[PDB]
Amino acid sequence: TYLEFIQQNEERDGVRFSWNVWPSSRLEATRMVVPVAALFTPLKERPDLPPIQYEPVLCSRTTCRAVLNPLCQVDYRAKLWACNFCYQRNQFPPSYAGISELNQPAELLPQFSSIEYVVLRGPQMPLIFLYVVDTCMEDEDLQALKESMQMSLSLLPPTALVGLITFGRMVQVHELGCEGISKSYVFRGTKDLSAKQLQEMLGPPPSNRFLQPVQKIDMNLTDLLGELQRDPWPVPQGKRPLRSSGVALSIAVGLLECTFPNTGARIMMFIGGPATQGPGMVVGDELKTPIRSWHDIDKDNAKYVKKGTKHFEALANRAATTGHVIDIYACALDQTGLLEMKCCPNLTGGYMVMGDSFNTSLFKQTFQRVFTKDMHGQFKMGFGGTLEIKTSREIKISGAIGPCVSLNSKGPCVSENEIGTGGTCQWKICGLSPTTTLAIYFEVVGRGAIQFVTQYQHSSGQRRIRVTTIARNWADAQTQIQNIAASFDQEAAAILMARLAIYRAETEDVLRWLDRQLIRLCQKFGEYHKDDPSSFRFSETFSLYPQFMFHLRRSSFLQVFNNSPDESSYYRHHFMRQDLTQSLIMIQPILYAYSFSGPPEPVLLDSSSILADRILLMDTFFQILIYHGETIAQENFRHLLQAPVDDAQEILHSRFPMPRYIDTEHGGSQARFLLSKVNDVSLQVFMDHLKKLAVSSA
Amino acid sequence: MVLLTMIARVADGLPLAASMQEDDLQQYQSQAKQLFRKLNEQSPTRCTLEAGAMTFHYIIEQGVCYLVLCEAAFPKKLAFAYLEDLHSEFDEQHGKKVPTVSRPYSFIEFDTFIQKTKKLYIDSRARIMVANIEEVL
Amino acid sequence: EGLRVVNLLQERNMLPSTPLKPPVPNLHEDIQKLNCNPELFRCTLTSIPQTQALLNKAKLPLGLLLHPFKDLVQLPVVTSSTIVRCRSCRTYINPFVSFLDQRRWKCNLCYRVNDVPEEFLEPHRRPEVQNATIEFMAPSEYMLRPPQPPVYLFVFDVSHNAVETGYLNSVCQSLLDNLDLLPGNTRTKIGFITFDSTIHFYGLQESLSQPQMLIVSDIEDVFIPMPENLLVNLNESKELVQDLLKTLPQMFTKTLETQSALGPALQAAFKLMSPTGGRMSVFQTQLPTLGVGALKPREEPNHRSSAKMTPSTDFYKKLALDCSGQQVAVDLFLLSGQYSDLASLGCISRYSAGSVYYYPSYHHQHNPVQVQKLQKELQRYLTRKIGFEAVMRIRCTKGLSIHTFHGNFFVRSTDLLSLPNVNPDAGYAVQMSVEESLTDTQLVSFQSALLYTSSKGERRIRVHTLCLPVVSTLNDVFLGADVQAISGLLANMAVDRSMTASLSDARDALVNAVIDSLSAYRSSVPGLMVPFSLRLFPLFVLALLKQKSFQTGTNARLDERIFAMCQVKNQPLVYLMLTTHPSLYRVDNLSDEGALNISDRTIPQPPILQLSVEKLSRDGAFLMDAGSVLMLWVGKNCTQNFLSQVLGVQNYASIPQPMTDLPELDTPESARIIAFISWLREQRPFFPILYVIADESPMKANFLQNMIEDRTESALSYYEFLLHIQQQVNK
Ligand SMILES: O=C(O)CCCc1ccccc1
């Protein structure tokens, strides 16, 4: 079963390809409608794989140097193996001398495709956390922010280093624990600083005066955080507070850059409002003028966007080059400036959390998921990931889309046509979790092979190497397109195609390219008589691709208006990171129905599903909503009224960005969220127009 | 939305208490003393004056004038509430000694309450007549 | 008394045994009894020369020396609702006006008749005409702004060398002991700044567990890091500043900061005080080397280098003028063990009406004398009265014109002086000339008037008025000469001559002053013949030439000579004379011819001895009153009764090496010498420490450096100096 095949390969190898059978000819590779791509999850969890505590074997060939995998052809008699990528034949290392047939190494077994090694590079560096704190917000927001930061300090490892930077009009770098005096270094939030300047002005396991071990400092930090008071500078009438977000971030970047470069470090920035002074300024300090909107940027009425975006974009590359992670936690009623700061958590593996106030269950709980631990009391996060992909000589890599930065490594696996962050065989992911998913786009220039090698720093400090080796059948020449049409992953393709459209919109029509491929895929793999729209059918392999495209082209990922720019950049941020299942939920929210007549059942995203005597539960990945029809909007009636509330709580915990919960009913203002995701104007109309063009000229 | 605050005895214009911080003061201080000289027992008890980008606000109680200057953009609603807080505190503490003193600024130590009250109005987070001043002068 | 002529070569013992008294102006009996106290106001020539030609013939400098803010025993305070001031020259109504119409008075400085307002009441009995010294209550128009509150900002250097000197401990201790004794009411504000290679502010909020040290490292671009709690209210935040003073000495014990950015630190402290003004105390211990205002090292001279002073930069001069414009005065405390270019650093206090304090080679353990000296000088500095945002103007009768000012201030327009602060220990001098012949009048008057803000927030005016007669005879000008006042005015002139030309020209102008005056006297009359008023003129000028300010062949260092000149420019006449020509008494045999009158105490009055080793004796002990100190020299063959009953020792060998003070033993000999010592330090508000360390072999015999009549290897003796003068007088 092809579905059993897709399921078991994602559970084992954390990957889902657009095609599981690849064009064996040049004549079909060029004519691929949906590019050969893969939804690769480098750190996916699974049923407790054995950590291989020995260094992986490698191929003895300067260029190739792939990892010993089940595809390799072994010879237990001569103690030799032949690399599957370059046919080079290797000798077994001395630790493999007692190799035997009835007891062979772990990597070789087809079950241990996708396996992790633990290597020792000497002393493991301590983890580094750098709190960057805004002080320009209300007291109830600042007091809640302080409690959350004190709670995160109780979870950090005793080995880890911590640093505190608060700001407002000025920027304060705190020198931790200097006993009875409490000092800090004051910098103007009006002019930027480079790392070398910041190094001169400021000055067994290592630690600075500004970055000290948790076990030795946690009591002074938990007190300083408890005494943090709002920015002492007054805010006159009709004015915004002077907030130097752009310089505070750059000082946090330059501090770690000159102290601990090239090591796992997390810059956690907390924002209560937009940057109002300095490089990276997002809006002026006059309350008369509002923060820019999508309408304002389209009519060239937003003089801070490009200059501010460029500032944080250079900061993003500075930190991503050094190998440091930039988190952004923004909670305010107005906009924050996420559009100008989006590149910092996008290029690195940084998080992006957005809410109305730090004094809510929404932010408080979301902030403590960041420090969730596994079956060993260790954070589910990795640092400084290096992703390298080995391909067969027939495959080339166009590029990647997702949280990564190009290491600009050249090799025969690089393709001329580059996509996203392309032109490289190696990418750096400064931060990753068991959820991070990159979209890798391949190109063909019989059993192909792709090997993913991910080196990262673990929460324990251990250096680990994740090696996943997949293999997909080459198409048979006498059955080329028929097998290709059978190995189609309609879900994986819809998101991989969505990845391309969104990346082009965020780096600017996009719907036109999205339709010309929808029509092309309908003509090559659909069934129809020419000039007869009613004859068009699709295989069960393809039937859902049109509907996924309908919702994608109408979603808030591409129709940015009726949303704020920060909301748009926040939606795109999480969609470029999630695996397949969650990404489907975003584009096409799931909808359950609750009534006396039957247990909960999923129903269509159509206006016909909104019944008066029924309770709905829509799962947008960003919000969980419960709807009560006009009838139910009033023990048996209780089982119904709390059946969605019960099912909500479960998923209301797993998901990292805790979805905003909503309880509304017919006539309520919050029912608008259901009516906008529900229901060209209609599918029916969208499908008909698609069929008229599908049976028409190609 | 700034500062200049003076308290003076209406009769002779004798200064009683003031408060000024710069980091000009020289011009609007004269105008403030010109007004204290013109004010008599027929002057309006509550008035507001316009001086271009600046605006004076004063009240008069028990022969004592409470003058404040600020940028015109400062709320005139808040300017009089600031003077009222000063009057009730000043009259309660020194209202019966005013018609007896003769030294200038015999209540400099009222500097303290002026500035701690002044900050409760020049911070949005903390939460009648009109005539051009060039006329009365 | 005496109109008699004196031969300086035959007397050679002309110095009197009792202290010198200022001359009495040859005035009418009723006028002189109202004249100004000579301690506060005096003139080099009590008989003013009628014409400039006569003044030039005398070859003597005409000028005034004043101590206007001196602590008084009794001060009349006029609270008049109106200040009567002459309608022309704005001269205050003084005791030396000429009441004619009984409702009209003639101004004694510009001769205009003024109308006595009907607020002046028997108009000649009003206190403004019965006191030459009097303090007014300034009206509403005598202040540019509401009276500023007392602001004190202390600036400490905390470099590596500074931490080694240990000065920070005792300074923070003195502030803790005298926190309630600082002049000011409930408006007093207090602040603190430390610095090394960076500026360290200190916030003080009652809501925080401890103060906060805000460091600004942008040396080329200083700013204020916080708007509220840097200068805090002392009354409300007494507890907060006491902890910081107890914690400051402990914050830098392990410092490696070898450099000091004094320039930017002073710019930081200025911006903090610019809104209100006040007094800024700066404690520096080494050469400034980092940032703007840095100074280059100089190599110290030796006894061999000739007379070949000025600032090496104008940064501190400019910065002082900026502080002066914001009513900020800077006081410099230099506790340096090496060269620090005080000739440049001193400009921060000369042009802001401050004063510099010098503690050479200060060390908490090694130098116990400088430790106790700083303690007693900080006691005075922290508890003496003070005036804020002050100005002073010196008026003088038409015909007499002031042309040069001496002292720590900033002269704005002519005959005006900006005093960001005014302290009761500052001295000032003025040089004048006869611009118009005084044929008209026979009396001229001088009036100084000090407008200032008190520590209690009250604008006041202190006014002194001096009246003198006019003469037209060369001999009459000589009869009224004040030798001490002439010596003091020449010292201020000689310091300016050094900065303007060289030390050689300064020494020559001093020598030429004695020659040209005594040769002009001789040309109007064998030996060296001088009038009675000038019998101590060459002695005091010789002592001026051996003082550390103008001495040459001595091994003295650079900052010593500069500080010696900063005291000449800023000290009252009395302490200049006490420093230049210290009073030497023999104290091992006191007895009763003393001024007992004081109730239960007897207080011996031993005779003043002249400054020569020929007057000492190995059989006894001698005390020297240098004004600021009281060195007690003990002879080697000293008597046994003085050892056990006064010193508390059994022999000369066991006199402890550094002896910080005498013991108070139960002996009549101790009671006598303690009474004579305490009487000396009661004549002054600056407690002088007394160290008996001056043994016959302590390597601290600078007691002998004050024996200004003996010859040394690089200076003449008093007899040689007389011999040199006579050769030039009748050349
Ligand atoms: O211009 C003036 O002289 C009056 C202001 C300065 C001053 C005041 C009092 C005394 C002397 C001088």
Ligand SMILES: [Zn+2]
């Ligand atoms: Zn190989």
Ligand SMILES: [Zn+2]
């Ligand atoms: Zn006059």
